[PDB]
Amino acid sequence: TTRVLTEAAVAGKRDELRGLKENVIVGRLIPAGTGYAYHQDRMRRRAA
Amino acid sequence: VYSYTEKKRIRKDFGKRPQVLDVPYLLSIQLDSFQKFIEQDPEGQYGLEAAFRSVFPIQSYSGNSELQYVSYRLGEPVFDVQECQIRGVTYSAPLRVKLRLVIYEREAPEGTVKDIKEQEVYMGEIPLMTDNGTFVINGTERVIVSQLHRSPGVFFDSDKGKTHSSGKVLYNARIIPYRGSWLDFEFDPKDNLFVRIDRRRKLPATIILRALNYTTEQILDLFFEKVIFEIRDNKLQMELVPERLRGETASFDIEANGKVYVEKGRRITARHIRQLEKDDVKLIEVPVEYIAGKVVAKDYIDESTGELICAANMELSLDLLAKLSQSGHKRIETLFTNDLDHGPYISETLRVDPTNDRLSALVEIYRMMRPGEPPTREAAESLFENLFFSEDRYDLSAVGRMKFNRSLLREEIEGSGILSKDDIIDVMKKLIDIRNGKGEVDDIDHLGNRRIRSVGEMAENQFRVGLVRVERAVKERLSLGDLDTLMPQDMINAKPISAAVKEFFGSSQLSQFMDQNNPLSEITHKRRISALGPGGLTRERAGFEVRDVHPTHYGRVCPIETPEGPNIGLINSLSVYAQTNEYGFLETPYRKVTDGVVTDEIHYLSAIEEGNYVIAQANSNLDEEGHFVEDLVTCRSKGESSLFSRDQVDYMDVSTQQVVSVGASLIPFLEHDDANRALMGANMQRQAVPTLRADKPLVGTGMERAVAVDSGVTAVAKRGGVVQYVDASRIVIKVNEDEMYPGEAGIDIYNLTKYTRSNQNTCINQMPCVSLGEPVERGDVLADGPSTDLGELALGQNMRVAFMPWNGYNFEDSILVSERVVQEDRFTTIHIQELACVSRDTKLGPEEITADIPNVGEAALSKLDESGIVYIGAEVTGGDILVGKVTPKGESDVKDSSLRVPNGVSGTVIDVQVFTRDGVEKDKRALEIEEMQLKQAKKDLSEELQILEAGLFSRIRAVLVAGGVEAEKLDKLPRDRWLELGLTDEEKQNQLEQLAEQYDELKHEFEKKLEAKRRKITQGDDLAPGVLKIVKVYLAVKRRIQPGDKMAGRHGNKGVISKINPIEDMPYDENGTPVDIVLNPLGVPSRMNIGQILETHLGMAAKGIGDKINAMLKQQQEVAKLREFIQRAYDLGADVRQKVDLSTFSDEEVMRLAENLRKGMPIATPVFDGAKEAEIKELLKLGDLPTSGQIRLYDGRTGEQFERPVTVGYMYMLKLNHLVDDKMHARSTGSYSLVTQQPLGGKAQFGGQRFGEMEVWALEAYGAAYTLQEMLTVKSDDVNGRTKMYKNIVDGNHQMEPGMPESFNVLLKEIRSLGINIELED
Amino acid sequence: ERMGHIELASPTAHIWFLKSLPSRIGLLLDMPLRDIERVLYFESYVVIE
Amino acid sequence: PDLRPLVPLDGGRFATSDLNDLYRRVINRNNRLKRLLDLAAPDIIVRNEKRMLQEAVDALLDNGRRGRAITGSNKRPLKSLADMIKGKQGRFRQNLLGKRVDYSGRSVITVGPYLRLHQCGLPKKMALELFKPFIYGKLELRGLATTIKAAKKMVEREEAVVWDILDEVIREHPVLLNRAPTLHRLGIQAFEPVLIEGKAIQLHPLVCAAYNADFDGDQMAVHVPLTLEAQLEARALMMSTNNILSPANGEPIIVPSQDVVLGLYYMTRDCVNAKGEGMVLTGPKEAERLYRSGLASLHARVKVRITEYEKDANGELVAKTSLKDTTVGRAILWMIVPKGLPYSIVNQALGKKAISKMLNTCYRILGLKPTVIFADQIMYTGFAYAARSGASVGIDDMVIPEKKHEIISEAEAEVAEIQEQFQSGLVTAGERYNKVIDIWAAANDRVSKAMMDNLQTETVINRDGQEEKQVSFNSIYMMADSGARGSAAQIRQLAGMRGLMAKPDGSIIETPITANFREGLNVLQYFISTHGARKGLADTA
DNA sequence: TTTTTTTTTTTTTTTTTTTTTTTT
DNA sequence: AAAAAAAAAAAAAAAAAAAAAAAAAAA
């Protein structure tokens, strides 16, 4: 975790919460199961 | 002739192999070790004497003052075991040492002293060892498992070709001392000898040699053989030795004496070397090119210029040879370097070596071990001297010296505790030889390479550590202090030694809570061998080598008893007959076989000596003389088995059982079982809770009396005699006049234990097993302990198992239990728990245990006494108030903090204790318990006095009969005046006064004992700093059987009771008796534990004979036919030992035997001698049960016959303590955590279950999103969402407001605590 | 939620950005990590422009 | 401060985290540094204090990386922010990816075969604790509770009215059963609870195969989906009746496992001459009626009139009736197979492969619900008729071969001859070793073959004639041939010799162990046969 | 005599699920 | 009486990844 977080900090990286893990950590719906459609809607409302 | 308690119920024995060595005292290890830890040794080698002589005397920093040790003593403990357990203090003895301080004078390096002073100083208290091998630390019974660590010495390990692509083996030697830094010597892929001190960075080996004052020439001379080249004015002749020519090809014509022995090109052959030897050729001629690459041995300096022509360890070349030719040197010494016999390992290592002199090597080693800071001329020298050649900081030990000398093939067996130059050089030479081809590696699992420390060795080491600490303290004090005539008491501090010894005995990987829920578990825990803890290999550091059963385990360590799971094999359990050699090695017994005769004399063989000799098998027939009946017999000589001749045999096993532990020798028909399932049985046999009425092993192994007697629980008469008073709390034994000492009139009072909690919350209880006025002899069972019956271990109950698949209720492994098992209440177990309430002294004010509690009603306080503490015997269910305690409260003005029974537990309050700090008030119940103990002690003391005083008064009466006869004038007056009568002038004149003075002394002893006990009872106990008092309560739950209560036999067949069927529904045979259990038979074949079916058959036979006895006794027929039947039952089998002819047995004793057998005759089946499958048929047919062992069962419910007759028999079943109500628990709105808002720990803390990282994939695999969303959003984490859904569900609305997990915010904050900025962009 | 802030009397290097094996400071200045740790130990001076 | 709590333990004792110790050290060092700078202390002292502050901040940020970790008064490496982030105990893997969960419980399990495929038992007490907010909601809806405190008190006292409310709630509210090692997605399945008295989570037997759950005390957790969407999820995705097909391979995961299979095997078989062989019956009903009264044994060859259906048409079932030749046992079995399947499926020995393929055929031809009911019926009837069989195992069910000792004598003679040849120098050590292992393997195979010949076909009876051979009914052969918790490998360690055993190195010992379990193993042979057991256990661990 | 590649060596990660005499 | 951090600790296998130092092998 030290390596990953240090590299992310120095690089100034930006995560967008798209996978099955970051959504799990953040507590939002899952982009795999029943939440799939919801996520698609979240994409459709955005940039519209 | 049989012992009386054995005569109560003599156990039929099927063993055909006679016993030659009775199973020794099962707790030899712990007792012997701790006895060697404390003993006055005239020549201190082991015990406190050893440590004291090692550290003392103590010399000041040239201060003309010295402190020297004199002697040591162990004062009697203030408290003893029972009150030590009840009160909670360690059962320790105070070690008190006489120390002598002496002051010297000026100008007296060894002159006489001017002043001396001796003082007895108390320094530390050591926890003594209870009679059962268990320490008592804080009211509990801790035990120190014995450790098994790699033996100190030299180990020539290999790498087995791994850790390299080439697959080359890199041999490496290691010197491991008992205390100090190690020393390794390892090779590399380039064949250079490298060293690494203390497993630190690597170095060339030769550096150490240079640090030992050895020049390059000295190194070459030590490790290489010189080859001499001569200059006979030309041709570069050379002195030849034939054997050095092996493995080489003749590049030129090898000739001498004008005879061509070998020619160019042809390889040198062994025939050629023999021909050279016969020719007696010493000097030959060789071309100069032979020296074109060879390495010079010693330095050469020109005689003219005094200049170094060439130094040692330098390959010679043609130019160098030409230069040194005219220099005037004719003799040249090179090194015999061969690729197969004498490799040039040292030469290449020296070439790699960058150091040049001793000082450079010492500087390098100092930078190595202590890098960074500059080296110094003195610092490096002192460090290296204090590394390997210092008695203070490096000690082989001696087991270490013996191993070091034996491995290197040295004559002596004792010497210095520190290495020497010769030692290191010999180690390097042996490693180089192993690399060469001669010599073999030493595996690190041969049990002649792993000691057994015990409590004694570890305790001694820790005491020595404390001793050196106090040594440093006194060293600082002395030189600092002057003579000051300061007594030797202010110099010594008792805190370091006591702290160290208590820290070891209380906190360590080894000093662990005893698993005190059986006699068997106690005895098997005390005889444990752990490969973990300080100084040993940890769990994650162990491969598969140490986890395996090396062929030297036979007879020393048990192969089939190791706790399965993460630590398997590292926790090996001792064998039955194993011992501890004087060096700590595991030696096992064997029988000496002479030319042809098997003499009964026993020799103990260590793991080393067993390899050389030849050892036979336990089951080898002999014909009344020790002569083998078979001329060929199986043996196991060098770790491998084979058929050997008759005379060639050397040793034979003492008894068949010695291959196993004591935890697996209790399994009947073990030899029929699998190894995995034998392990399961022997690991699940030491968890059986002591049932309410432990009954019997109906099929034992003949090795059950020893387990019960030798473990402390069973109790046993110290001296033979006749019972005088038996009560369920105490037993009084009148010792026989012959067994009594002349002085005292001794009567032995055994105070039993009644329902006290054991460390696993099971209830240990001792009841009497001897009626009033019954004789008892030495070492016979009086009070059966928990899970014992007439001295025989009884771990469970023997019930009528019936193998058949019943309606699926025993599908996988489940066991169907008839309700007759619970109606008869035979598996009921008493679980005693302890709850505590501590009243402290808060800053706001002291806490109180007043009965008045604010805001509570009257029913809640009803069960409390006037002092507010629950009554003894009140039936308290969940939530009740057990101790009414209140505390000061800030801006009633007090807060209720009363201890209450945890929800779920429901039992009777059998006992209450109240400990009060010295100088603190006592409450009503404390006074009641104090008065109870006081009256009990006073009554016991008076009862003890009674008979002793009565004997003296009877003697006084008898004396008064003669010389002043008073037949009727004496009895009328009170006995008090019987000691004040005159006498005539005779030898008896000074007898009345003597008896009167003796009576006065007796009364004085009585009153002082009473006063001492009163003081010990009334004294306010010692507690922690800041605690006013403690109130403990003992609940006594009684758990019955229910679906979930795990049950398991002894052959490692387990199962969860799956249903308690009514009596009728169970299968029943034509006689009406319903089978009390219905197992699943499909688990027998696959699991291959076929021992249990034979046990079941033998159990059916046993109860058949028992029921025949019961029928013959129901009608009062006679003793004669009972005699005849019991004799025909005990004479069954062939060759069976233990002729038990009942002619000697008295008629009343025969009747008592019939009474104790009517429940079923016990049968003994030794582990590996066994009852033959043909004898079981005979015993079944002795009754009337079918020989095959299977009867026809009628289905309970349908009422119609079962096809294919089915097995039934009396199997012995335990009740493992994995009870269901200890496990089952559920949570809905329990209190959450503080750091990350989440549920709390399980069960007692009311927590939920772990939806772990592996249980979130199980949902993601599905199309499950909402369920996962809630499972990690609102069920556990989101602070407001759980409340919102709580109200919604109470409102009937099924929805959520997920929000964000609080733990995510916690992580964000913790990341922001670092120098990294993290946020949530939208 | 509320946080504080401690004002060091001297600047202090961040270990994560100093001792991670691909040491960020180590290869930022192209200076060997040993010569940097030596500087942080006040064992030697370093020219600064 | 809250993230590094300083709560007072009961009794005026304070429990604190290690962040506090490090922060205190840092502030103390910073104060000393500022004081030294104020006092203009010499260069060495200020440099030392600066270095010490550097080390203190190093420890606070990430302890145990630069230098050696600084311990507290407990002589252990204290945990800093880094140790709280990373590690198996860190926030990521302990409190973010998976957390302890409310509305949950755990317990030990049992068999409970009366359950249907889609409902698991649930102890009354545990169920009451789990569904408590639901009980409160229903009570305050029904008006029996004036306030929430009254409802809580009524539930705590466990009034008799609460049980009806709980049975109303449980009706349609799936609960997720979950074993501890959930390796694959079939380790979390949602059943419908059925209230049970006691303290055991009764679990349908078949699903054990999916869980690898054996009732040797292996514990299970129940979670409760709360929201409406989660309930519908556990109803439509995770229900046990929906996972009748594994995710890794297209084979079912509801195979009748070890006792149902023995029941069917014993019940779908033929005896050459049993009671009432050779009569004609008017269908499965007549066969069952004959069997119950005992007039005809369970398996006797007879002729039965059966109607079998086929869906060869465009989704339309067509029947055909014929006088098949079968046994009364198969006639009884046929009443459970659904309409579509053909009779030939239940006209054979019906071991474990045949029964599993029967289930697969039912699933692929009919769908899902028919196969679920078929699996339930198969389980019920298999259990019942295994019970009726009374299939036991005694010490007379391991018939050691009559020619075992002859084979062992031949092997001993051969090994003696090879040893003599070695004494003559004709054979080297390795070659003789290979020859000896070869002869021992051949002898062991011969012994096993003799065993199987004397165990599987040995049963001989007569039917209007001299004699005739038949597949034997010896119980161990029934439990091995059927595939129900047995095999030809796990047998031959009971009757025939148990082959050779390997040493710790992995080598093969020259002399095998020539005693089986029916005759007991002497000391040396058993000791040899522990290397394998401990190697296996360590390998599993 | 300098420079690039390859090799070696040291160091950094991972290693299952649940259940106490001494300064302010 | 309130507070407070030094030590001499020393120790582990196995395996692999990655970075730094060292040694060939030139032109």
UniProtKB/Swiss-Prot annotation, chain A:
Quaternary structure (record): The RNAP catalytic core consists of 2 alpha, 1 beta, 1 beta' and 1 omega subunit. When a sigma factor is associated with the core the holoenzyme is formed, which can initiate transcription.
Residue ranges crossing the lipid bilayer per the database entry: none
Organism annotation: Escherichia coli O139:H28 (strain E24377A / ETEC)
Shown chain mapped onto the complete sequence: 1328 to 1375 of 1407
Function: DNA-dependent RNA polymerase catalyzes the transcription of DNA into RNA using the four ribonucleoside triphosphates as substrates.
UniProt similarity note: Belongs to the RNA polymerase beta' chain family.
Protein name, as recorded: DNA-directed RNA polymerase subunit beta'
Curated annotation (Swiss-Prot), chain B:
Annotated keywords: Acetylation, Antibiotic resistance, DNA-directed RNA polymerase, Nucleotidyltransferase, Transcription, Transferase
GO annotation, cellular component aspect: cytoplasm; cytosol; cytosolic DNA-directed RNA polymerase complex; membrane; transcription elongation factor complex
Domain of life: Bacteria
UniProt GO MF annotations: DNA binding; DNA-directed RNA polymerase activity; ribonucleoside binding
Modifications made to the protein after synthesis: Acetylated on several lysine residues in the presence of glucose.
Reaction(s) catalysed by this chain's protein: RNA(n) + a ribonucleoside 5'-triphosphate = RNA(n+1) + diphosphate
Keyword Transferase: yes
Family: Belongs to the RNA polymerase beta chain family.
Quaternary structure (record): The RNAP catalytic core consists of 2 alpha, 1 beta, 1 beta' and 1 omega subunit. When a sigma factor is associated with the core the holoenzyme is formed, which can initiate transcription. The rRNA transcription and antitermination complex (rrnTAC) consists of RNAP, NusA, NusB, NusE (rpsJ), NusG, SubB, ribosomal protein S4, DNA and precursor rRNA; S4 is more flexible than other subunits. In pull-down experiments interacts with CedA. (Microbial infection) Interacts (via flap domain) with Escherichia phage lambda antitermination protein Q; this interaction renders bacterial RNAP resistant to transcription pausing and allows it to read through termination signals.
Job description of the protein: DNA-dependent RNA polymerase (RNAP) catalyzes the transcription of DNA into RNA using the four ribonucleoside triphosphates as substrates. Resistance to the antibiotics salinamide A, salinamide B, rifampicin, streptolydigin, CBR703, myxopyronin, and lipiarmycin can result from mutations in this protein.
Protein known as: DNA-directed RNA polymerase subunit beta
Organism name: Escherichia coli (strain K12)
GN (gene name): rpoB
Swiss-Prot record, chain D:
Entry's transmembrane regions: none
Residues bound to Mg(2+): D214, D216, D218
Entry similarity comment: Belongs to the RNA polymerase beta' chain family.
Subunit structure: The RNAP catalytic core consists of 2 alpha, 1 beta, 1 beta' and 1 omega subunit. When a sigma factor is associated with the core the holoenzyme is formed, which can initiate transcription.
Role description: DNA-dependent RNA polymerase catalyzes the transcription of DNA into RNA using the four ribonucleoside triphosphates as substrates.
Protein name: DNA-directed RNA polymerase subunit beta'
Organism expressing this protein natively: Escherichia coli O139:H28 (strain E24377A / ETEC)
